[PDB]
Symmetry: C3
Subunit: 624 residues, 3 copies
RNA sequence: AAUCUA
């Protein structure tokens, strides 16, 4: 039992009592909230040629969570917040795993107790760190996670639920030893850049104390690490031979500025098919995947050497230039709001739909209605159809990537959404084409569609992704020099080190999500990435303002309307019907929903004036 | 863009703007309704030994303006209407794919906008044709698709939502060039054969106009088709050798009239096992699938040659004779209605259950799973259990074929269902044995069960499946000679050219679904198949009428009962309970449904008189 | 058609009219309830290397066949009673399949009609026996299945639904020929052991009558069984050679009493890896699965010979000795009740949560009827997370084992739960570690957590699992001698013959689930297993009484509270809001549930007193 | 998905 003091907060780490059969287990307690995290890793390599790591953060009970009704419903039973927490934990621990660790690994978080004051999500990230640190699973260095908020101008570490409701910043920092950053996930209320960057510095300082406490527990326990039967990394001899074969061909392809996404990928694949043939004859004993990964290592190295040495990218841009940006509005008459945002080869269609407040946050069943509430009656639904990348995939159910991307785009637009709007605002973003940051494209497209729809937002929101390419000597592991790329392509995210998504208005930062593929990056690099994104964001907002700069004076005339119709008491029985049968039937044939607000008056919501005409006829004929 | 004029309707076809990464994309607009359809086909051969083709039609109710109803505020699962539309689109485009195209292919329909006037389902079929035509996917000539209605005796092309509700015919025709028909799918309010037949030729004329417009768009934007790695068809010299080995044995098996379904299949399989081992020796280098498919082609040719040359079928029937039909009602005492319909070796058990009216208004707003209500309170649930074919299969959901078969039988019996019935009518059809058109047997058994249950249907409904065997030119492809088969077996559907399922009253037609496997059939064959089915339907109805000819004078004694119970204002709180808890608990353990009618009246629906005795006893003690 | 008489009840069994394409089919009718069961078995062996039998029991309607639900199955699925009934049917017919019958088999039950009087679950078990008996699927003798209930001290065979509500015992017996017992599944209202044992004897007698009726119909039909392409039992030549190689090594491992679960399994796998390599050289032509299964046979045989010959278990204790039992309560402050129960290397964490009574209903007529409503507002949710065995598995959803084990643990604790409790009682049992009877440990842990939470249960409930090792005649098939083991380990469960899970208080039996892996066992062995378990339950109940012997005088100070707020008619519209908007908004921002009592009263349920305070502020400010 | 050192 090791206690770590974080200002006025107390963190307690324990192990050896619960779940002794798991490879690693830990209990993290703050106040009266305890989280038990377990780590299991199979010793037999997985058939899949990557690192299979699954994080499942499960809430035992909100009030009384009980159980989903049936088995297939139970598969749906995973809530949105549990999915988001699992992705944060996964992003915090994935970079620290060794290369070639192709072994099935599962990290499970079980909420032993929740006091309703201390948040269990932060404790779950630390619990994952302690469980892996104490386990025999090879995992490079412990990590510490804290939350930073700003309450009346003061920075608070791990704020309570009450403080978070009055905070202008919701930043979660995961830090590696010697003051590195592994995960950044923020949601700010359009706060200044200087205020934002100071909170990152404060958060990193706290995570070092947690790492110190975890290191003390690890030493006192006497942790021994397993030796995996094989680490799946290409041998240096095969890799340097692949470099000799395809250095010039890949260099010419990556310096060809006439390529598009498909043309470039086909050109690289054409070189690959030639290289794999020659590689197999030279090394017949090599594993079939070892041939594949050797080309990927060589191609990635050549791709990064061009930007490092020449400061020019594969499409002829320099380190700070954006791709072509085009915007459109009100492309379809019937939609309440519409926009088509294009950025390079990334194309996103955004639609705004208004609906009644009751039919937007209120569900029939109270038990499932919890956690489905929206503060401003605002939600964003993000779709990534398989045809966006010319692929075939199932379209049943939202996966975790679409869920996280929708939450990130909703976080960016949330601060500018006005309060007390008469209707629930639902923004739907569909990625028609994907060659880069579709989620930040959904923030810009969603901003345009909101202004077109006529909802009076405070300011336009633009997002951008910042890449990173570093040169690190293996003998030291430190970063010598690096480049920051603005508005990265898909290949730059794939062959880079960080996909630093950052969104906000021209005068502040609204959301941030840094996905670092390196085992930590210095504090200095993150600040420069934020500043570099500030310049790019202002340029994007200039292009957006040309298409539309202010919200329309009013909503479209074919939009929803909210009004009241008087129903007398003597007529209440026939109008509503037995058990609300008549009202339920009307809401089915026509989209009009009728809600009772007074013993004599009923509020009728009509999604369209034409939909009003069918409903108004329905009430009049029943009225007789 | 290309504009196609269809009477007073205008069709707009466009491409090259949205979703440019897919192999083919198209936007089809009618009025303010726009639908985007994309087609993606993999270039590597599928491991499956058939053509994997998936069509998904998603409503995306953001176009309508009322997208969210559930607590997740996003669509969960697939609606019944969405599944049926995906089936219609799939049937329109599947026959036009070349033989041996064993490549994964997905067609996705995104509803960009809907105006509530023009139906997007018809535009989705045309969009699938344009997307496939402009793509590089190997696909035959363009397919036009229109919906033909009859309003005040006038034939209307692509009727609006308002006209579709006043139409006595809902016919969808998909046409190929040269006025061929690839898909027929209709439901009529017991209309005459002459009126039904005229609408078909009117619809085929309009689909040629669409084809001409699509061909112009293909000419304007240059379309080059890909060359697949290979088309998986058996080699001609392999097929002709299999003919030498197994022509005589298959000829004897197919001319043996003492075979049943299982014995005929075993006899053919015995020849297949002996032939395959000889084929492998003759062609050691041949693909293992090429050996399997070569026998299926030879067997299909021998099976069809007997019908064409000798006009005699594999079971001894002629082209017009029906199978033995046995009807029998009143299966069990407690069922409200029941019937056991036997048609050859196809056995179907149909049950009728009377539910409350309140159980039929389940929409997505009330319950997340089920959306929509039936115009008449009547639905048909169709089951195809795995033991019907002596097979093992998952008994879970996600069965597209069962949903499609149930919809076909439901609309076959829909026109005769009486209006303003006091109870919801639920017809459950189970296939106990299957050797043919079990779906059509669900209409015959369903009407027998409806009459046995006491429902005053207007007239009896009988269904039948008409097969087809053609002898086309090996080069021209023109249909030279053909035979229409009445009440086909399973092997006649598998080895045939279409499964022409048409049901109706002795005086009219109520439903039709033509599943053509040929790349279009002449309009003359469709008309002759309709006439041939009219004669067969009369014979089936005569057999059915002997078992039962009119509905029973009253419902069964153990049928549902509805009457009110009066409670005082003082006892309302105790009777209803806190938040309706007492009513929901009594109605969950006793089985009755209680709905409030007035301030003193409660309507109780009891499925059985015994159930009302239990509910009455519970009311008495509560009222004490 | 054959009619079998069971006292005042009548069974009608017929075949040959419905679904003639299936391998086996039968209709079993009692009263106006008819159940149709089919059996399909593939003739091509499956590559699963075990018996792939799946039993699916489906009902057209819920609440005694009064609410149609077949149409809703597409998006909703199968309810838990359908899962439990399928499990019971599977356990009644699985042990009678021949060894090595690795062929896909599916048994499906279709409720043709239900009258709301005769329960179709019992008829489904008999229909599975008749359908398999008349089929060509290789299967052993027929099984008769009856239900026995005690109504006013009288034993009733196949009691009606109305009778079952007034019964103190719900016992389902599946019997084999020669009065053998195949499946036992009982829940009792804390009845005496002697009354429980007599009902088993009565049930076995009634199942013999059904078997004689089924055998008559089989003879009349003239059933001929198929010859399977292969039976996948390991060859005796390979088994005898594996014995020579691993008899001595496995003997030392199983007599090493310092082993724990992981070390013992690792030591066994060490021998398996070496022996399986030597086996391949001796029989290169042997099936690779045959090599695997031959070692499993030898290891099981050596494991059993130690118990029979020496009367010592693999961990050093004797046949009637329990494992080390550790109990602990009140570990987390905010939990309404908690308990950590340890039994050997089995660890179970049990939590008690109080909710409002309205949480039992699901707000929908069909959905609430599908899952039912618990009689005493009490249910137990049982989880078996994959880290309990150091395994990786899909964590979303509850499989068949988790649902059945949770129902067994809920059955044990149900008789002692008090009535008229102001709150809904939810018990969550999580298996942190598993090495034995986790479900039985969930009854003990749940009893500790209920007393700690302050629930006034009538008596503490303890459970245990009894194993069985028999020396059966190679040809005669009779049990020469046997040993009953108390509180078996997982390895003794794996290599044993029975999972006799049995729970009860200090003065009666509350639940029982016998999982027999043999093709029937004599009723004398069953009687001794019940007696041996009563001794073990006494010792367990004494240990748990030291940790906590009586429920706490009151619930925890941070538990739920139900209050009442009075609102005027003028302020009702503002308080409830448009269409109950404000009430639902509060229910999502604080977790409190407000329900209308009358025109003036609203009842507020708050999980914590703090939630009551903040919600009370909202009511005052909104008014 | 069933069974499964649960």
């Amino acid at each position: 039992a090791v206690a770590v003091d974080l200002g006025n907060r107390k963190l307690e780490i324990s192990s050896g009592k619960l779940a002794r059969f798991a490879d690693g287990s830990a209990v993290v307690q703050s106040g009266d909230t305890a989280v038990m995290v377990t780590a299991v890793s199979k010793t037999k390599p997985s058939p899949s040629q990557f690192m299979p790591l699954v994080v499942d953060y499960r809430q035992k009970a909100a009030a009384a969570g009980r159980i989903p009704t049936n088995y297939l419903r139970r598969e749906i039973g995973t809530s949105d917040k549990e999915i988001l927490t699992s992705r944060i934990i996964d992003r915090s621990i994935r970079p620290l795993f060794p290369a070639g660790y192709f072994y099935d690994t599962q990290v499970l978080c079980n909420l032993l107790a929740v006091d309703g004051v201390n948040e269990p999500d932060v404790l779950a990230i630390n619990g994952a760190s302690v469980a892996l640190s104490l386990s025999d699973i090879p995992w490079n260095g412990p990590v510490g996670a804290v939350r930073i908020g700003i309450i009346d101008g003061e920075y608070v570490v791990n704020p309570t639920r009450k403080e978070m409701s009055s905070s202008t910043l919701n930043l979660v920092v995961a830090g590696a030893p010697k003051s590195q950053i592994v995960m950044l996930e923020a949601s700010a209320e359009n706060i200044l850049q200087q205020d934002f960057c100071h909170a990152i510095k404060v958060g990193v300082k706290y995570t070092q104390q947690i790492i110190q406490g975890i290191q003390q527990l690890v030493k006192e326990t006497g942790v021994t690490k397993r030796t995996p039967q094989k680490l799946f990394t290409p041998s240096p001899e095969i890799v340097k031979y692949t470099h000799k074969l395809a250095m010039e061909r890949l260099y010419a392809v990556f310096t060809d500025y006439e390529h598009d996404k498909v043309s470039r990928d086909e050109a690289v694949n054409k070189i690959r098919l030639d290289t794999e043939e020659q590689l197999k004859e030279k090394f017949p004993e090599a594993d079939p995947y070892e041939i594949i990964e050797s080309f990927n290592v060589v191609a990635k190295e050549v791709f990064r050497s061009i930007v490092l040495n020449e400061y020019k990218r594969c499409d002829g841009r320099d380190l700070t230039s954006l791709r072509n940006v085009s915007c459109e509005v009100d492309m379809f008459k019937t939609l309440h709001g519409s926009a088509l945002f294009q950025r390079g080869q990334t194309q996103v269609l955004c639609t705004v739909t208004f609906d009644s407040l009751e039919s937007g946050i209120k569900s029939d069943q109270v038990i499932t209605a919890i956690n489905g509430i929206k503060d401003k009656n605002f939600m964003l639904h993000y779709e990534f159809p398989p045809y966006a990348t010319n692929e075939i995939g199932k379209v049943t159910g939202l996966n975790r990537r679409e869920l996280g991307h929708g939450a990130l785009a909703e976080k960016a637009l949330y601060p500018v959404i006005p309060r007390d709007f008469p209707f629930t605002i639902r923004v739907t973003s569909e990625v028609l084409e994907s060659n880069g940051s579709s989620s930040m494209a959904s923030a810009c497209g969603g901003s345009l569609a909101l202004m077109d729809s006529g909802v009076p937002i405070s300011s336009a929101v633009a997002g951008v992704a910042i890449g990173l390419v570093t040169k690190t000597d293996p003998e030291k592991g430190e970063i010598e020099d690096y480049r920051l790329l603005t508005d990265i392509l898909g290949i730059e995210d794939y062959n880079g080190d960080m996909d630093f998504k950052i969104a906000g208005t021209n005068k502040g930062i609204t959301a941030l999500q840094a996905d670092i593929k390196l085992p930590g990056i210095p504090i200095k690099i993150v600040m420069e990435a934020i500043q570099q994104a500030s310049v790019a964001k202002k340029e994007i907002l200039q292009i957006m303002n040309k298409t539309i700069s202010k919200p329309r004076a009013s909503r479209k005339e074919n939009g929803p309307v909210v009004e009241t119709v008087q129903v007398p008491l003597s007529k209440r029985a026939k109008f509503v019907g037995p058990g609300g049968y008549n009202l339920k039937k009307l809401q089915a044939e026509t989209g009009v929903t009728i809600s009772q607000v007074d013993e004599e008056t009923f509020s009728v919501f009509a999604p369209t004036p034409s939909a009003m005409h069918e409903a108004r006829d329905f009430i009049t004929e029943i009225c007789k």
